[PDB]
Amino acid sequence: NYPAEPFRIKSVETVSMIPRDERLKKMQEAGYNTFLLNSKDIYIDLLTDSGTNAMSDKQWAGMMMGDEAYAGSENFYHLERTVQELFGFKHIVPTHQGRGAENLLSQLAIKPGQYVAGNMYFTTTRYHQEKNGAVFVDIVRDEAHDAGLNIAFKGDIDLKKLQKLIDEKGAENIAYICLAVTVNLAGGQPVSMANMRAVRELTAAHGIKVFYDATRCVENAYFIKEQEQGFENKSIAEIVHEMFSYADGCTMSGKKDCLVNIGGFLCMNDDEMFSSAKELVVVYEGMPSYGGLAGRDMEAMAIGLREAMQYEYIEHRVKQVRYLGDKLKAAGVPIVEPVGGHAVFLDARRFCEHLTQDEFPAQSLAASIYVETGVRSMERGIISAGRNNVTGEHHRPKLETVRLTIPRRVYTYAHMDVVADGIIKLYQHKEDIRGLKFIYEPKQLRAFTARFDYI
Amino acid sequence: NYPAEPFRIKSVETVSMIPRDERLKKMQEAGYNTFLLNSKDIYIDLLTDSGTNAMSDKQWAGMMMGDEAYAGSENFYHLERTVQELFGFKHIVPTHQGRGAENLLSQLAIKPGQYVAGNMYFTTTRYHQEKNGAVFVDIVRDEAHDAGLNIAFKGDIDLKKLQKLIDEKGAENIAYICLAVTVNLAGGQPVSMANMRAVRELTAAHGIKVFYDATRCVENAYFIKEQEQGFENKSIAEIVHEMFSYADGCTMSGKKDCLVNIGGFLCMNDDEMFSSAKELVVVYEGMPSYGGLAGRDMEAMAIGLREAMQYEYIEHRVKQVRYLGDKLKAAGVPIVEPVGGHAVFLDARRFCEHLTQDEFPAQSLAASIYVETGVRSMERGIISAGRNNVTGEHHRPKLETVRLTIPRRVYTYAHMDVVADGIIKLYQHKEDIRGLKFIYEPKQLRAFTARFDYI
Amino acid sequence: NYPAEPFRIKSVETVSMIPRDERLKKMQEAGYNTFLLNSKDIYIDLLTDSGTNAMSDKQWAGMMMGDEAYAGSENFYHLERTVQELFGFKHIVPTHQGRGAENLLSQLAIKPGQYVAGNMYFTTTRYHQEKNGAVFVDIVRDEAHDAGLNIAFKGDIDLKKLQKLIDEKGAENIAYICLAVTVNLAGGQPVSMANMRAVRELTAAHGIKVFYDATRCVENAYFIKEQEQGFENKSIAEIVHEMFSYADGCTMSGKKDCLVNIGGFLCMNDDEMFSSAKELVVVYEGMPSYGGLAGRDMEAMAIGLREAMQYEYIEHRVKQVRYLGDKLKAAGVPIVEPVGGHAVFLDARRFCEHLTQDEFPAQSLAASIYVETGVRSMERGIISAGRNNVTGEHHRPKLETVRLTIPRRVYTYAHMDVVADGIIKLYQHKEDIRGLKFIYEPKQLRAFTARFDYI
Amino acid sequence: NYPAEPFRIKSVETVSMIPRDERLKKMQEAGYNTFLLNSKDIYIDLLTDSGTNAMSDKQWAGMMMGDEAYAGSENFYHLERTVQELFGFKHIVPTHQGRGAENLLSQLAIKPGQYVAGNMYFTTTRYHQEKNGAVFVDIVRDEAHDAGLNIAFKGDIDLKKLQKLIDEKGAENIAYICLAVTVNLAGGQPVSMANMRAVRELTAAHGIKVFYDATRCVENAYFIKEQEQGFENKSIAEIVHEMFSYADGCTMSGKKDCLVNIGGFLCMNDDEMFSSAKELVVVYEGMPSYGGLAGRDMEAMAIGLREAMQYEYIEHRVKQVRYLGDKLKAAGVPIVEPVGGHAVFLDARRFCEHLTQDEFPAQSLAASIYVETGVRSMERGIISAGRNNVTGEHHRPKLETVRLTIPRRVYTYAHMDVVADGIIKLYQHKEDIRGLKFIYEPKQLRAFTARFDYI
Numbered sequence A, B, C, D: 001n002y003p004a005e006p007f008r009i010k011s012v013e014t015v016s017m018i019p020r021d022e023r024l025k026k027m028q029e030a031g032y033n034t035f036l037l038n039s040k041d042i043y044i045d046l047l048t049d050s051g052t053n054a055m056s057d058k059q060w061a062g063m064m065m066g067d068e069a070y071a072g073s074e075n076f077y078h079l080e081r082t083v084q085e086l087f088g089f090k091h092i093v094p095t096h097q098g099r100g101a102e103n104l105l106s107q108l109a110i111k112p113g114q115y116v117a118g119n120m121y122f123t124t125t126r127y128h129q130e131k132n133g134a135v136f137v138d139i140v141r142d143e144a145h146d147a148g149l150n151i152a153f154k155g156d157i158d159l160k161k162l163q164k165l166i167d168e169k170g171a172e173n174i175a176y177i178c179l180a181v182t183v184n185l186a187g188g189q190p191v192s193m194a195n196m197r198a199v200r201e202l203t204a205a206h207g208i209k210v211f212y213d214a215t216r217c218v219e220n221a222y223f224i225k226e227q228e229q230g231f232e233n234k235s236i237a238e239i240v241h242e243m244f245s246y247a248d249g250c251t252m253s254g255k256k257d258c259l260v261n262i263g264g265f266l267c268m269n270d271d272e273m274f275s276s277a278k279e280l281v282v283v284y285e286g287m288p289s290y291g292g293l294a295g296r297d298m299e300a301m302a303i304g305l306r307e308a309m310q311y312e313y314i315e316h317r318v319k320q321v322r323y324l325g326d327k328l329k330a331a332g333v334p335i336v337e338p339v340g341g342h343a344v345f346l347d348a349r350r351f352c353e354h355l356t357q358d359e360f361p362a363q364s365l366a367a368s369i370y371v372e373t374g375v376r377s378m379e380r381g382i383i384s385a386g387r388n389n390v391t392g393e394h395h396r397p398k399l400e401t402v403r404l405t406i407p408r409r410v411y412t413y414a415h416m417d418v419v420a421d422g423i424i425k426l427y428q429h430k431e432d433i434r435g436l437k438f439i440y441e442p443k444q445l446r447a448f449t450a451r452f453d454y455i
């Protein structure tokens, strides 16, 4: 049912668990914000799957062969041809990570006053869109905002919402469609190939461009192979290649499905757009032949992207996350369903029924999880959404969750059992979790550096 | 009951993951001899725990700081102070691995005609003793020769057997006592501290030297902390240091409990013998400051020896092997008991009761294990026993076993489940396992290059 | 006169060593543009000293100990304490390289309509200043614009020019003073400590902030120790620490004097500005605890910054460049004087007097240098100057040069002889060097992808 | 005349020079024996070219891909096919270093009472020969024992001495001919292909086997390409392959011309001899599939052997040594001529004319070189030869030299200038070097651990 690791351990990293009394003082030192905890004080660090992956022996062999030249590096050509072969795009510009590519795309394809629509948003992607004068519109299906609803391909774009946007606003006022695979905020939920084919069908008829947020496209491809009829005989590589044939470009964070600790890139097919991207990348990232990355990192990212296409690797990656989610569900712990490809999301509304959203249950639950287990998790609720135009009123999203994000090839099933057993025991006395109050809030992006205090 | 890994994965090693029908063709190409399989064709390689360990990030950092000087390397001095601090011996000479140190010890401490006694033997250790003119005498307790007998500290030396040897032959005719921790041939069985203190008491009264075969002393130290009363408050380091306080020297294979892939050393307290050891090491290994080792390897062994002292590491190491043994026992699979610190031994005679020892049941069971799971194990029965060269007849041992030897920090519990589930599945249909016949047998060391075919 | 390397070679990098007739075919394939050569076809790559450095064994040991956590990495804290100890600034935000830090500084410290003044400019620094609405004013001393003038500390700011700006425009209309050490565009010319103290004296009296472009501050510190009276007893570290005591912050490119292949950071003393910097870094680079960098790269930069403080290292670095300049000057080759800390600039106008600037003598000389020696150099003349987009006419700079930029710890004196002997041999028959004509010119950034053919 | 390094520096190792007053105390602490100095106290360590080489980026990439399996490692198969391809031998057995292979060969091919003849000897090779009951006979040409005689191919075997040995002793009493390439004790002197062809011609006519000591065969191949008529058009690989076609086997120390820090192997063509070697290697070294080496070290040795065949690499290696020798000769310093492939030998008899061989001028000169320059060198004189059968009488060889041994790819020409300038200045007051007296002498192999005191 759950496969063993399709690899061996080459090298290990020592870990240690500090006692509860010290975890409590660390949590108070961090202002009850898991973002402010020190890495050395964490047993199992499930804060994010971004850049926290373990590399292979092949990737580390490439690390010893870094061609650090400013132009014409062999590492760049290797990364270039690999992406052209696997993704099928004509041009590629490397960037130091995903939000570097998003900065380039938002300045190239957005006119002040236009609309950008997509299946939910991400914080950095939406910021660069809004900074360049766009208004974001969520066109994901309504069921994606309901945590407990267990349906397949929750991340699909609602075609009726997309049709309604084109009719009310016009096609000329739409910059592009931003299709994310997978959808991070909905719980790592996949998008079906039929939805990608249908979106491409409707947008091309109105001359609207489609750009993918491809950070977790490999996990998305596995869900297509597993659950969409007609793709069970297709390889992961074939599905990934067909996915991108419905996009005019993409922004990629190699720190996710490329199995590296740093790196990203921007892809496109248009020649004029690629020429403008090279003029903008030298301002923010670097030369088009390295783009803010060391040669050895372009090499590791090229090798890692090819390793991710192995069916056994991605099957184990996804089913390890599913294993953690199944143990939590079997004990009655409320989670977002279905389990996504990279994380399990605890439903803090049901976990902390005795608390209101104004008491920040997700931020308080993440603090209690660390103090009780030594596991770091990320708040994904009201604090990440922010406040807008009303003086002091928070955004209220339906999803008030705590994210247990699994780095790739770093932890074992026994580590998943430690996480599950500690959360299940915490769920027994969930009424003890206390509310939080803002003692410091930045002007923007409060989730990263805000400090709180108990109620 | 079974702890999770007290570390996370830093880097992984790629494996093939070939299907069963291809593993069958690989096994036929190897003549149904697991010793002839190529490493690249193996999922889980349980052939040996020697030199197959995974190193830590700290060790690989030391690998980058290799002082490769021919004499006076900083890496040697680091290894020297580490062993002097942890083992308590005065002098140390590095060797490329354990049998290099045994070659030196046998030439230094044995006069032609003397006797060497010890708690059973190992192949290379007994050869160097006999090569230099010694006669080996087994003084282990009788209970060590009972495979199914589940008692603690099976590797203890029988004090009455040792007393009888001293009286009949004399103390001047005894070269030394060779005390192995643990006892590999008995199944990795530990020796009690009380037995070590008693041997030191008896030999010192007759002027007899005691040298340890300390290859797996860390695993032995854990058994003392776990099962011997009075040591439950002692750290692993304190137990190890007290163990060697009853010996005049030791031979160590770092490829086991020092958590490296190559290396060993020879320790002693006598100054004159250390002076002769330095003259002999330059003939066979190298300078006393590197002894057949690269500088970076002395550094990794010094770092690894200190990492082995962590209680959580060695507890998990031993309980990971115990997990495999308990799962096999709970399903009714016959194993050697009790489970040792480094391996589980399947009883192939009881596993393949429908086959005779002339049909090589252990060799045939090892072949089936690979084909069904991709797991390589080692035959330890009539094939590895060899032939008597005078009569031409096989040596026939009471132990017809298959050894599942677990490298340190390489595999997870999920890998142990792969091994267990496939063997349990084989045991349910064990009547289908067929005998083997020699199609090629070399003159000597037939275990390594013999080829077979089904009967 | 010229010291030997204060280090030995730990590991080497393979090179092709292709003959002259093949280098000619490579140059023709590259359209006679050294920017289009492949790295694998280059023996000595003097294109830039940015990110091309060789690291030490200590740095590579740190590469194995990367803490890749998203927040609170131990590598960040190590980098933080190192910069606070060596530079003396209160706060630090890491960036993926120098132009990432410049993007942050320009958005934080510039109000639309204000002025920025500095000792000449750099391309990326001036862009981010002008992008945020500033007007750049050159306040360097007039002597910096004389190529052949051999005087010390050519990069000093003219205090009278700075005083005139404050009086005519007002202090409230001045964003900050951008003091670069060293001054790249003037040829890597250093700034005196007395000039730094005087600028801090004048700006502090008017409430004006001073930010350093500290990319090559270590090379600058050596010039102070070597040529400025009163600092001959001071260590490199003491001089560096005193330099930054006259600044309110700095932007650093670790790819230069931090002896790494990627990395940078932003420093400042003000608490409120540091609070705003943490909100802005998560948009463009990443979390304030990694800032677009892998953990291992923050570790290598922390180790490399401390290695750069060794007097013997920086003395050899600078005198290796001086050796190349002295050998060219002793043979009569026209170079920019005095020789800077990181590169030698050939005067291509005097080298190719028989050619006009419309025939691209610097671009043609760089092509001949590669074909004759396998050395890549960078054109810094009319081609890299660009075209005015309104008129369509080339920008015509007084400096028509070829830059021989020396990476740190990569090449030896024998490699410098290869460069010198081939250029001296070319200078003896310089009348044979032919002009070039555009066969392909891109719309922008023509230096990188233009292709030429002989005239 | 002298080529630059045909590689770039990938990573560096920090070095440091301790003052003279500390170098003096270190030399006294070492008993005036450079073998007892600590590596950290040495600026330029010219003690040996064995295992002190710098590896390439390709080799370090292979280090990350160590297949550490006990049998069937991919690293072993790579090393096996590389040696079969480059050396042309049928079988190969890996060993941890050269003297491990010599131990195997001496036990396989020597009967007690037989003679072994060769072009001079080495300490470990002659010991294993004499330990197994052989009597060594030097059959090198007489001119090899004259330090100042500058003739080509000084290491050739005298065919008349070989013919005389066969006639006086008989062919059945000759175990084999041990042909070393190059000849270490004569100054690294090459053997001509014509001499190898002639030796093979004479021995095959009497049924006598020939085994090569191939540790520095690549350096030998370069001398053949440079100085022997008819081989100037042949590649290094072709010459190496033809060299071994005149041998029945070889012993190799990879620590020399394979550009690694540890490793060796034994080659042969006979099937019965290879079968016996596998039985003996498991006793002393390990399995025939790893032979006392980690997988990653077999990989580095396989990659390094192929890199050594590059003409530019070996040309620079040899001419860098020649550069040091030419500077010493141009200043009047007495050296062994011609300069060998791996070291310059100072003639201590002419250097210390005022001292007798009983005062150990070579051992005293090596001590003075370190104290005055921080350079470590090796004594190669009376102390290395030993005493035999007379009670207290030393062996007296014509060569009383001090060896300046150059590791491969570690030092630069500027480092050679530091060595030369310090020795030339020492030669000005050579009358100050004092004699030495034995204060401690081991029973055997006194050169490594003897301690001395001034006269």
Ligand SMILES: Cc1ncc(COP(=O)(O)O)c(/C=N/[C@@H](C)C(=O)O)c1O
Pocket: A047, A048, A049, A050, A097, A098, A099, A100, A122, A124, A125, A180, A184, A213, A215, A253, A254, A255, A264
């Ligand atoms: C869908 C998606 N797009 C873009 C980014 C930004 O990419 P980057 O610049 O970090 O490489 C992220 C980052 N998500 C991370 C940070 C997370 O989920 O924790 C993401 O999840």
Ligand SMILES: Cc1ncc(COP(=O)(O)O)c(/C=N/[C@@H](C)C(=O)O)c1O
Pocket: D047, D048, D049, D050, D097, D098, D099, D100, D122, D124, D125, D180, D184, D213, D215, D253, D254, D255, D264
């Ligand atoms: C010709 C020759 N053969 C064999 C050996 C022994 O090989 P090893 O066991 O050291 O790999 C050496 C070692 N010479 C070294 C030690 C030297 O000249 O310093 C040697 O020079």
Ligand SMILES: Cc1ncc(COP(=O)(O)O)c(CN[C@@H](C)C(=O)O)c1O
Pocket: B047, B048, B049, B050, B097, B098, B099, B100, B122, B124, B125, B180, B182, B183, B184, B213, B215, B252, B253, B254, B255, B264
């Ligand atoms: C108890 C014991 N002593 C000595 C040795 C020899 O040490 P080297 O292997 O380091 O020379 C071994 C190795 N046992 C290995 C070979 C096994 O169990 O497969 C051993 O188990």
Ligand SMILES: Cc1ncc(COP(=O)(O)O)c(CN[C@@H](C)C(=O)O)c1O
Pocket: C047, C048, C049, C050, C097, C098, C099, C100, C122, C124, C125, C180, C182, C183, C184, C213, C215, C252, C253, C254, C255, C264
């Ligand atoms: C003085 C100076 N400031 C800022 C920068 C930009 O820093 P990053 O390159 O780290 O973004 C550079 C780089 N100069 C390089 C590009 C050269 O001289 O080729 C520089 O020389």
Ligand SMILES: [K+]
Pocket: A068, A069, A070, A293, A294, A295, C050, C051, C052, C261, C262
């Ligand atoms: K770089």
Ligand SMILES: [K+]
Pocket: B068, B069, B070, B293, B294, B295, D050, D051, D052, D261, D262
């Ligand atoms: K070495």
Ligand SMILES: [K+]
Pocket: A050, A051, A052, A261, A262, C068, C069, C070, C293, C294, C295
């Ligand atoms: K990271």
Ligand SMILES: [K+]
Pocket: B050, B051, B052, B261, B262, D068, D069, D070, D293, D294, D295
């Ligand atoms: K190994």
